[PDB]
C-alpha cells in the first residue's frame, strides 16, 4: 500500500477503464492487499460506475465555467483527500491530473511519488505540457515515451509498460490453399479522419489476387464507406457486420479463417484490437502511426508496418501475403507478443513503479 489512481472523469465503458480496474484488483491481491484507491475530477456525474464495482473512489466537482477556477477547486479538493488518505504513490491516468497531483502535493504537505500513465498520444490530446509535473512516467507505447522525452524528460525516468491482453487457447487459422485471402477490419468506421477506411479500400482495390474483406463495426460514415466500395467496384468482396458486442466470437463462429487484420489509421490511442488479433494468431498489417503498432508488429514475423501515407507500400504488403511470398505462421504469432500478456505485463508494470521508489 498505498496507491492512488487519479484522473478526469471518463465514460465508464472504455478499454482504459478495463485495464485500470484489472490492474487495481491484481494489485489488491498481490501482497496481503497493497491498497488502491481512485479519485476523479468531474464536471458532472455522467460516468458509469459499474467498472468501479469493488473499487474505493472519491470525486471532485466543480462545473464553474472559467477553467482557472475549476482547476483551483480540483486542486483544493484533491489536497484535502491527500490529507485523509495518505498515499505513497499517485498515478495519473491523464496529463491534466499530473498538474493537479503536483499542485495538491505542495498544498497538502504530504509526501508521495507521482507517476504519469497517459492512455493517448500527447500530441493528439490537450494539456500535453502538464506531463512534466509528474516525477516518473509509465508509457504504454514507445511513441508516448518519445513524446515525453521531447518535453525534456530523461529516458531513465520513463518506463515503457505497454498494455495487457489475455492469453488465448485457440488459434484462428489462415484460409486453406486455393481459397481467397480473407482480410479483417475491426473498429469504428471513419472514412477519412482518424481511421482512414478510405485508405483501406484504396489499397485493397489496387491489390493483385482474390480477396474478401470482413468489416466489424460501424459509425456515421457507414453509408459513405459503402458508396466508396461501390465506386471502387469492390462491393461484392466486402461483408459488413455492423456493430458487434463480441467481435472475436463473430470471427471464430462466422469467418473462421483469416489471412490478416488490417489497420490504416492516421493515429491511435492504443490499438488494442491488433493485440487481440495477434493473441489469436492473426497477422496484422498496420500503418506505422502514433502510437502502438510498431511496438507490437515485427515485420515479416507477425505482420507488417507501412509509413503513414505510403499506400503503395501497403499494397505491396497485401500482395505478398495474398501470394504466399511472405507467410506468417499463425501457430507461433501469439508467442510474439509475450510482454503484453496479463501476468508478465503486471510484473513489469509493478517493477516500473517500485524500481523508481
From Swiss-Prot:
Disruption phenotype: Mutant lacks the alpha l,6-linked D-galactosyl residue of the core lipopolysaccharide. Deletion mutant shows a lower invasive capacity than the wild type, but the difference is not statistically significant. UDP binds at residues 244, 276. It is an enzyme of class 2 (transferase). Pfam families: Glyco_transf_4, Glycos_transf_1. Signal peptide: none annotated. Transmembrane segments: none annotated. Pathway: Bacterial outer membrane biogenesis; LPS core biosynthesis. One of its GO terms (biological process) is lipopolysaccharide core region biosynthetic process. GO terms for molecular function: glycosyltransferase activity. The keyword Transferase applies. It catalyses: alpha-D-Glc-(1->3)-[L-alpha-D-Hep-(1->7)]-4-O-PO3(2-)-L-alpha-D-Hep-(1->3)-4-O-PO3(2-)-L-alpha-D-Hep-(1->5)-[alpha-Kdo-(2->4)]-alpha-Kdo-(2->6)-lipid A + UDP-alpha-D-galactose = alpha-D-Gal-(1->6)-alpha-D-Glc-(1->3)-[L-alpha-D-Hep-(1->7)]-4-O-PO3(2-)-L-alpha-D-Hep-(1->3)-4-O-PO3(2-)-L-alpha-D-Hep-(1->5)-[alpha-Kdo-(2->4)]-alpha-Kdo-(2->6)-lipid A + UDP + H(+). Keywords: Glycosyltransferase, Lipopolysaccharide biosynthesis, Transferase. Its EC number is 2.4.1.-. Gene3D superfamilies: Glycogen Phosphorylase B. PANTHER family: GLYCOSYLTRANSFERASE. NCBIfam families: PRK09922.1. Belongs to the glycosyltransferase group 1 family. Glycosyltransferase 4 subfamily. Galactosyltransferase involved in the biosynthesis of the core oligosaccharide region of lipopolysaccharide (LPS). Catalyzes the addition of galactose from UDP-galactose to the first glucose residue of the LPS outer core. This is Lipopolysaccharide 1,6-galactosyltransferase. It comes from Salmonella typhimurium (strain LT2 / SGSC1412 / ATCC 700720).
Amino acid at each position: 500500500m498505498k496507491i492512488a489512481f487519479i484522473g478526469e472523469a471518463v465514460s465508464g465503458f472504455g478499454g482504459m477503464e478495463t485495464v485500470i480496474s484489472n490492474v487495481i484488483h491484481t494489485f489488491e491481491n498481490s501482497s496481503p492487499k497493497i491498497n488502491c484507491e481512485m479519485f476523479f475530477f468531474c464536471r458532472n456525474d455522467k460516468m458509469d460506475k459499474a467498472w468501479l464495482k469493488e473499487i474505493k473512489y472519491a470525486q471532485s466537482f466543480s462545473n464553474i465555467k472559467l477553467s482557472f477556477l475549476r482547476r483551483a477547486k480540483h486542486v483544493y479538493n484533491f489536497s484535502q483527500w491527500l490529507k485523509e488518505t495518505s498515499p505513497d504513490i499517485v498515478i495519473c491516468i491523464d496529463v491534466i491530473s499530473c498538474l493537479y497531483a503536483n499542485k495538491a502535493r505542495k498544498k497538502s504537505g504530504k509526501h508521495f511519488t507521482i507517476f504519469s500513465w497517459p492512455h493517448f498520444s500527447l500530441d493528439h490530446k490537450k494539456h500535453a505540457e502538464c506531463i512534466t509535473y509528474a516525477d516518473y512516467h509509465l508509457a504504454i507505447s514507445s511513441g508516448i515515451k518519445e513524446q515525453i522525452m521531447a518535453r525534456g524528460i530523461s529516458a531513465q525516468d520513463i518506463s515503457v509498460v505497454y498494455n495487457p491482453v489475455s492469453i488465448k487457447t485457440v488459434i484462428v487459422p489462415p484460409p486453406e490453399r486455393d481459397k481467397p485471402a480473407v482480410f479483417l477490419y475491426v473498429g469504428r468506421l471513419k472514412f477519412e479522419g482518424q481511421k482512414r477506411v478510405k485508405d483501406l479500400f484504396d489499397g485493397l482495390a489496387r491489390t493483385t489476387g482474390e480477396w474478401q474483406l470482413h468489416i466489424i463495426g460501424d459509425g456515421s460514415d457507414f453509408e459513405k464507406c459503402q458508396a466508396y466500395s461501390r465506386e471502387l467496384g469492390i462491393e461484392q468482396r466486402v461483408i459488413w457486420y455492423g456493430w458487434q458486442s463480441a467481435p472475436w466470437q463473430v470471427v471464430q463462429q462466422k469467418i473462421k479463417n483469416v489471412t490478416a487484420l488490417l489497420l490504416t489509421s492516421a493515429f491511435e490511442g492504443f490499438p488494442m484490437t491488433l493485440l487481440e488479433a495477434m493473441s489469436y494468431g492473426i497477422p496484422c498489417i498496420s500503418s506505422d502511426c502514433m502510437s502502438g503498432p510498431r511496438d507490437m508488429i515485427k515485420p515479416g514475423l507477425n505482420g507488417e508496418l507501412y509509413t503513414p501515407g505510403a499506400i503503395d507500400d501497403f499494397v505491396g504488403h497485401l500482395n505478398r501475403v495474398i501470394s504466399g511470398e511472405v507467410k506468417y505462421q499463425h501457430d507461433i504469432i501469439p508467442g510474439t507478443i509475450e510482454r503484453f500478456y496479463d501476468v508478465l505485463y503486471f510484473k513489469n508494470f509493478n517493477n516500473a513503479i517500485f524500481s523508481k521508489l
